[PDB]
Amino acid sequence: GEQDWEQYRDRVNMLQQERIRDSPLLQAAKENDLRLLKILLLNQSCDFQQRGAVGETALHVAALYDNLEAATLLMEAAPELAKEPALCEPFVGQTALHIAVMNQNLNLVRALLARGASVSARATGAAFRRSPHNLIYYGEHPLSFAACVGSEEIVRLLIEHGADIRAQDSLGNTVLHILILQPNKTFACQMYNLLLSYDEHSDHLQSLELVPNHQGLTPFKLAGVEGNTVMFQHLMQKRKHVQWTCGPLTSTLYDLTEIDSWGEELSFLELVVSSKKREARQILEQTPVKELVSFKWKKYGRPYFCVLASLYILYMICFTTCCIYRPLKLRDDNRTDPRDITILQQKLLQEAYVTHQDNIRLVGELVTVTGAVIILLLEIPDIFRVGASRYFGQTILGGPFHVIIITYASLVLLTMVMRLTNMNGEVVPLSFALVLGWCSVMYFARGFQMLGPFTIMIQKMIFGDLMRFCWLMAVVILGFASAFHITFQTEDPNNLGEFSDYPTALFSTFELFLTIIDGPANYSVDLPFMYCITYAAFAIIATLLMLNLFIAMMGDTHARVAQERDELWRAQVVATTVMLERKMPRFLWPRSGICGYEYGLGDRWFLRVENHHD
Amino acid sequence: GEQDWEQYRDRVNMLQQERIRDSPLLQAAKENDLRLLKILLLNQSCDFQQRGAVGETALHVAALYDNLEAATLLMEAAPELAKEPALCEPFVGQTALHIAVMNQNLNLVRALLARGASVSARATGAAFRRSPHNLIYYGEHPLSFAACVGSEEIVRLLIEHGADIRAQDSLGNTVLHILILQPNKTFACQMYNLLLSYDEHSDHLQSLELVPNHQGLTPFKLAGVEGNTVMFQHLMQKRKHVQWTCGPLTSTLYDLTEIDSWGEELSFLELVVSSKKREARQILEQTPVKELVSFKWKKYGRPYFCVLASLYILYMICFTTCCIYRPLKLRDDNRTDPRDITILQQKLLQEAYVTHQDNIRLVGELVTVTGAVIILLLEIPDIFRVGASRYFGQTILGGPFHVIIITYASLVLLTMVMRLTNMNGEVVPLSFALVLGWCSVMYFARGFQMLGPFTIMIQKMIFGDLMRFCWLMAVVILGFASAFHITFQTEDPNNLGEFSDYPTALFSTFELFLTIIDGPANYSVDLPFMYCITYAAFAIIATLLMLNLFIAMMGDTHARVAQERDELWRAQVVATTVMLERKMPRFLWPRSGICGYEYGLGDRWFLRVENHHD
Structure with missing residues (x-):
């Protein structure tokens, strides 16, 4: 691939205008020059099946520019032009009926359909598919075009000429899926009522509402995915009825069949x-959904989350104590290596199980590794279910805690490999395990409103502002650490040895940036004067300016979400409820809502909502 | 208890609708199907005393859905249905008159009262009591229902059929108490004037205004508790009169009898x-109240608070100096224990009173302990008066300073036990006492507008943000302190001994979080490389990110109350005024306001307010 899409799309859009300029019939369709077009079609003339650079006809050009005078004269001379689709790559299958509806030209649609335009024509070209570089997605059928332009009269005219409302495009979207994807949502529900009124369940296999997608989503299920909350409240108007109303009080009964989705995988x-x-x-704060996941969280979600929190916390204490007590013996080698002298005075034991206090630890360590495969048997089936990047990417479904808890379970499994292999570097996977293990306890901080939105801000600072600061911090601690190394390369490393090596000078200048270590000073020796100029420059540019600007933008990434993660915590417990209702067994979590079978109203399970209004 | 309230309340609300669906008479009451209901009641038929699942009649169903055609045909066939209450748990005592008023159906109330509906019926069920899970509280009598719906015509019709306005419900609320608990406050005072106009003091024992509650509160006293400032300003319109008005100036005389509450306990x-x-x-910033507690604070509150502040501060200096000088002698045991060698070089004296300088301290220590029982004799009678959780919980009445000053007086009493018992650990209760003693001086910071709202922010940070940060700080200093301990478990503890023990590694990682201690470094030895990876990870995640995010939310808990504790300090001196007017004696604090007895207008004590208006 040398060129890209839009450079090809601009080439088609200008090749198309050239052929209109080149052919006098196509120009007379564009100009509405019915003077010339009468003289031109009076004689034997240009073939009416002459095409543009896209496969357009003269009737497509006469409808792209709303010229119903020229389109009448074209169809009177050539009646077979109404059934003609375009033929080349972007506009494949687009007929003049696809354009006369998209211009909302009603009198052109009547003139086209009288000439035998096909309402079942589907524009299968790539300039009609739902793609991020197409500006609109109106479907493929002209009935689907009339809905998304919001024209009530074309829909009432296209059904009368035999457009089935269950017409499914190449994405699997029927027209009810496509009305939900439209942006002017409060004008789309009136077309939604109009389209359901013409449905009249003669087919009644799924009654146009349960007709799924190619991704399985019904239009009710798609309104929650796209966040069409205006269409969602309209869709719940037919899934409820008011039991009684007494002054300000009102008890209404929501259907909850398509929201709870009991048998659905x-x-x-x-x-x-x-x-x-x-x-x-914003779907999760709607009138049947908010009451349902609040009932699931309080009655069963938060009690079952807190025992799992109190089990994992008690699991991590058992892992920590098997790290604190761990098999270490005094080293075999006398330290003949006093080079920045070796403070390592003891090494790992090999198969240390001699004492009874060790046998208590053997019980303890097996809780860790069998607790870790339990972690692995819970998560790696679920990376194979949602797609392993939808899993790790979405930060409200755990997100960068499933990455951590898998890495934690990988490292303690790697540690028990090393304990049986008698490898020596056990301290390296354990130190990664203890950090990742105990910081994964912050997963359970979503179960509490105090601690809830506070832990989303840490994820928006590790990924948001740390990746916008550590690049422009690493250039400062590479220029200055080198500058501090060169100034101290020619000195005694026993007096101010904070920059003796270049790896340690990167470490000291990393610390002096954060001022977690003291500024290097030795007042009993003459430091090089270039250091006092470099360090005074460093302390201003790095310590003073660049920290308190990073704190200034980290204070703004908190202020921008301190009114926005109180609403994401309310979506973080919903993702914890439905994670838990799916995983742990069925005798916990009975079906939520009132069974409508012990009362004579069906088998659907309802939710009753009592509300007050002045 | 297996199920909860609303799952029982939803069961009643759906059992009730089932019986309406099951019985054709109850359905015809709901449908307004007077075709069927004429044919049904033409013959000998279903008993009219048939009930729903709650004890409802057909007349209750015909009034829950405002069907006065069906309710006329029900009462013509069965006239004894107007006097029928429901009989089961939530709706006990609810009559059809309770529903016809609550729907504001005036022509149904006239048709019910003509059939002999009882206006004195009281809905004693649990779905009418003032409870946090009921959505409204309208009282129990139908006159009380007509007031809270704001229907002037039903009240003018219910009095005419003999509803006493002094009707007291199970909470003790008369209808004047219930109008104050309503949310549309500016529409409730017009019902309040209408209800007082029909009172006309024929009873005149308390004249409907002094009629207390079961918690003793009159309606004027209840408007201050519920914060009904719209009703409060309306209630002070009858407790004032303008002495004169001269252009912009106006001198008005407030009654101050029910505000000051002189003889009241x-x-x-x-x-x-x-x-x-x-x-x-917001009651404390109203036109007679703000001028009264400003007069009490300036004339007597702040002078008497500053001497008590200057006495307690001078008391704490006397306690501090008896801690600084305290009986210590060189230790008896030669230190045979050089294990992280014992720096304890001296111990407590036993009965040390030999010198004259000690006898000055004996005078000093008795001021401390008798100052402490004085503290105890002032506060533990007052925990037995308001309820020991209303006392400690409310943070404007001292709150978490009465907990501190009781704990301070407990510890110095515990110290004088140990001084007589010759216990050795006197340093432990004294160190807690000196901190709690001197931080209790911040109680007196409410007496000064500069220092006033500044000390409420410390209480909203100790309890607000510290409990939202120390949980997610303790998981970081448990993962990293363990990770720093394991990496240093196999080293020499004499070189970088900041993580030698696990208790001290918790302490060092607590300090390195706050960077109140230096980053551990020893450039003359080879530190383990896993430490430099763990510490560089620690300094970013804990020092840099998690502090400056906690400061970011602590900066937001200050910005959110820097415009809101300037109004809580104005409520914190009122709670200090009335604390002080009650405790310290009566010859200080004379009666505030002008005695209306030396002038010929009563014995009520008035407050004169001169105001300006353009």
Whole structure:
């Protein structure tokens, strides 16, 4: 690939205008020059099946520019032009009916359909598919075009000429899926009511509402994925009824069949919390959904989360104590190596199990490794289910805690390999394990409103501002650490040995940036004067300016989300509820909501909501 | 208890709708199906005393859905249905008159009262009591229902059929108490004027205004507890009169009898500052109240607070100097224990009183312990008065300073036990006493506007943000302190002994989090390389990110209250005024306001307010 899409798309859009300029019939379609077009079509003339650079006809050009005078004269001379689709790459299958509807030209649609335009024509070209570089997605059928332009009269005219409402495009979207993807949401529900009124369940196999996608999503399920909360509240108007109303009080009964999704392998609520669209989190604060996941969290979600929190915390204490007590003996080698002298005075034991206090630790260590395969048997089946990047990427479904808890379980499994192999470097995977193990306890901080939004800010600082600061911090601690190394390369390393080696001078200048270590000073020796100029420059540019600017932007990444993670914590417990309702067994978590079978109203499981309004 | 309330309340609300669906008479009451209901009640038919699942009648169902056609046909066939209450747990005592008023159905109330509905019926069920899970509290009588719906015409119709306005519900609330608990406050005072106009003091024992609650509160006293400032200003319109008005100036004379509450054991002003409701602090900025507690604070509150401040500060100097000089002698045991060698070189004296300089300290120490029982004789009678959790919980009445000053007086009493027992660990209760003693001086920082709101922010940071940060700080200093301990478990503890023990490694990593101690470094020895990776990870995640995010949210808990504790300090001196007017004697604090007895207008003590208005 040498060129890209839009450079090809601009080439088609200018080759198309050239052929309109080159051919006098196509120009007379564009100019609405019915003077010339009468004289031109009076005689035997240009073939009406002459094409542009895209496969357009003269009727497509006469409809792209709303010229119903020229389009009448074209169809009177050539009636077979109404059934003609374009033929080349971007506009494949687009008919003049696809354009007369998209211009909302009603009198052109009547003139086209009287000439036998096909309402079942589907624009299968790549300039109609739902792609991030197409500006609109209106579907493929002209009935689907009339809905997304919001024209009530073309829809009432296209059904009368035999457009089935269950017409499914190449994505699997029927027209009810496509109305949900439109941006002017409060004008789309009136087309949604109009399209369902013409449905009238003659087919009634899924009754146009349960007709899924190629990704399985019904239109109700898709409104939660795309975050169409205006369409969601409209869709719940037919899934409820008011039991009674007494003054200010009102008790209404929501259907909860398509929200709870009991038998479904991929429920409605996982598709809302694992949706990458960002207005999908406003679905979780709607009138049947908010009451449902609050009932699941309080009655069963937070009690079952706190025991798992109190078990994992008690698990990590058992892992920590098997690190604190760990098999160490005095080293075999007398230290003949006093070179920055070796402070390592003891080494690992090999197969140390002699004492009874060790046998208590053997019990303890087996809780760690069998606790770790339990961790592995819970998560690596779930990376194979959502796609291993939808899993790790979405930061409300655990996200960068499943990466941590898998890495933790990998390292303690790696440690028990080394304990049986008698490898010597056991301290390296254990130190990574203890950090990753105990910082994974912050996963359970989502279960508490105090601690909840506070832990999302740490994820928006590790990934947000640390990747916007550590690059422009590493250039300062590479220029200055080298500058501090060169100034001290010619000195005694026993007096101010903070820059004696270049690896340690990177470490000291990393610390002096953060001022977690003291400024280097030895007042009983003459330091080089270039150091006092370099360090005074360093302390201003790095310590003073660059920290307190990073704190200034980290203070702004907190202020920008301190009013926005109180709403993401309310979406973080929903992703914890439906994670827990799916994993741990069925005799815990019974079906939420009132069973509508002991009362004579069905088998659907309802949710009753009592509300007050003045 | 297996299920909870609302799961029982939802069960009643759906069992009730089932019986309406099961019985054709109850359905015809709901449907307004007067076709069927005429045919049904033409014959001998279902018993009219058939009930739903709650004890409802057909007349209750015909009034829950405002069907006065069906309710007329029900009462014409069965006239004894108007006097029928429901019989089961949530709706006990609710009559159809309780529903016809709550729907504000005036023509249904006239048709019910003509059939002999009882206006004195009281809905004693649990779905009418003032509880946090009921959405409204409208009282129990239908006159009380007509007031809280704001229907002037039902009240003017229910009095005419003999509803006494002094009708007291199970909480002790008369209807004037219930109008104050309503949320649309500016529409409730017009019902308050209407209800007082029909009172006309024929009873005149308390004249409906002094009729207390079961918690003793009159409606004027309850408007300060619930913070009904709209009702409070309306209640002070009848407790004032303008002496004169001259252009812009106006001198008005407030009654101050029910505000100052002179003979009352529980005054009006303690019920406003110790109220847990949060709009009760706007009562303290109203036109007779703000001028009264400003006069009490300036004339007598701040002079008497500053001597008690200057006495307690001078008391704490006397306690501190008896700690600084304290009986210590050189230790008896030669230190045969050089294990992290014992720096303890001297011990406690036993009965040390030999010298004259000690006898000065004996005078000093008795000021401390008799100052401490004086503290105990002032506070532990007051935990037995407000309820020992209303006392400690409310942070404007001292709050977490009465916990401190009781703990301080407990520890110096515990110290004088140890001085007579010759216990050895006297340093432990004294160190707690000196911290708690001198930080209790911040109680007196409420007496000064500069220092006032600054000390409320420390209480909103100790309890607010420290409990939202120290949990997610303790997981970092447990993962890293263990990770720093394991990496240094196999080294010489004499070179970088900051993580030699696991208790001290928790201490060092606690300090390195805050960077109150230097980063561990010893450039004359080879530190383990895993430390330089762990510490560089620690300094970024803990020192840099997690501090300056905690400062970012602690900066936001200050910015959110720097415009809100300037109004809580103005409620913190009111709680200090009425604390001081109650405790210290009566010859200090004379009665505030002008005695209306030397002038010929009563014996009530008035407050004169001169104000300016353009």
